[PDB]
Ligand binder design. Structure first.
Ligand SMILES: C[C@H]1[C@H](C)CC[C@]2(C(=O)O)CC[C@]3(C)C(=CC[C@@H]4[C@@]5(C)CCC(=O)C(C)(C)[C@@H]5CC[C@]43C)[C@H]12
Lengths: 246, 8
C-alpha cells in the first residue's frame, strides 16, 4: 500500500532523480532561444551526406538515452526489479522518454528544436530522408508544448512512461504493476495538489509513443539496408543494441 | 552487451 506521507515522499524522490539526470537545465535551453541557425547554416546541414547526418543524430540520441538510463537507476524500486525486467523496461521505454524530454528543447513559437548549439526547424534534418518521421516527432513535441509541463510534471510522467507493467517479456509482472500503481498515485496526487488534473485528458494516447518508436526503427532499417557498413562501423553500440537488435 | 554494463 501507501499512505499520504509515503506518496508525497515518492513525488519528491522522482522529481529529484529527474533533476539529477536531466541532460540540460531548462533555463539553459530557454536562454538560447534567440540563437537560431542562419539560412546558410541550415543549407550546410541539408547538404551533408545522408549517412553523416544519420550518425550525428544517432550519437545525440545515444547521449540522451544514457541520461534516461541513469534516471531509471535512481528511480525508487527500479533497481529492485530483476535485471531481465530492467532491460525489458529500458529497451521499450528509453526512446519514449527521450521523445517526451525533447519538448523541453522545443520552441513552439517558431517550431524549432535546440540542436548542436542552436535552434533549427525540421528542414534542418532534410538530409536524413525521413521527413514524415521528423514531422511526426516535431508534431509530438508541439502537442506536448501546449500542455505547459512543469519540470515536476515531466519527471512524474516520464517515470510512468518507463515503469509500464504491460511491456512484453516481463518476468515479474506483478512487481512492476505495484511500482507503476505507486507512481500513478504520486502523479495524480501532485496534479490534484497543484490543480493541474485538467491535463490528464490532454496527454498523448498510449499508442502514440509506441507508434513513433516503431517509425524510428522502421526508418533505421531502411537506412541500414542502404549503408550496412556505416551502421556497423560508425553507429554507437548502445544505439544498435536498442534499435537494430544486436 | 552495453545495457547490462550500464546497469551494474
Ligand atoms: C532530449 C534532448 C535534451 C533534453 C537536451 C539535449 C538534446 C541534445 O541532444 O542536444 C537537444 C536536442 C534533441 C531534442 C535531444 C535528443 C535527441 C533529438 C533527436 C536526435 C531525436 C529525434 C530526431 O530524429 C531529431 C528530430 C533529429 C532530434 C533532434 C533533436 C535532439 C538531438 C536532446
Amino acid at each position: 500500500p501507501a499512505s499520504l506521507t509515503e506518496i508525497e515522499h515518492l513525488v519528491q524522490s522522482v522529481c529529484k532523480s529527474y533533476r539529477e539526470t536531466c541532460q540540460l537545465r531548462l533555463e539553459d535551453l530557454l536562454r538560447q532561444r534567440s540563437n537560431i541557425f542562419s539560412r546558410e547554416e541550415v543549407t550546410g546541414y541539408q547538404r551533408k551526406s545522408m549517412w553523416e547526418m544519420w550518425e550525428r543524430c544517432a550519437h545525440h540520441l545515444t547521449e540522451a538515452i544514457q541520461y534516461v538510463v541513469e534516471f531509471a537507476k535512481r528511480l525508487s524500486g527500479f533497481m529492485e526489479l530483476c535485471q531481465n525486467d530492467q532491460i525489458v523496461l529500458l529497451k521499450a521505454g528509453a526512446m519514449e522518454v527521450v521523445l517526451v524530454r525533447m519538448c523541453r528543447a522545443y520552441n513552439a513559437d517558431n517550431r524549432t528544436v535546440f540542436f548542436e548549439g542552436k535552434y533549427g526547424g525540421m528542414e534542418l534534418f532534410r538530409a536524413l530522408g525521413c521527413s514524415e518521421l521528423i514531422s511526426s516527432i516535431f508534431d509530438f513535441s508541439h502537442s506536448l508544448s501546449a500542455l505547459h509541463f512543469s519540470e515536476d510534471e515531466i519527471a512524474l510522467y516520464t517515470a510512468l512512461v518507463l515503469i509500464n507493467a504491460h511491456r512484453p517479456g516481463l518476468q515479474e509482472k506483478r512487481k512492476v504493476e505495484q511500482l507503476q500503481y505507486n507512481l500513478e498515485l504520486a502523479f495524480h496526487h501532485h496534479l490534484c495538489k497543484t490543480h493541474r488534473q485538467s491535463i490528464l485528458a490532454k496527454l498523448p494516447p498510449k499508442g502514440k509513443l509506441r507508434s513513433l518508436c516503431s517509425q524510428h526503427v522502421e526508418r533505421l532499417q531502411i537506412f541500414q539496408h542502404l549503408h550496412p557498413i556505416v551502421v556497423q562501423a560508425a553507429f554507437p553500440p548502445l544505439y544498435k543494441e536498442l534499435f537494430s537488435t544486436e | 552487451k552495453i545495457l547490462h554494463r550500464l546497469l551494474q
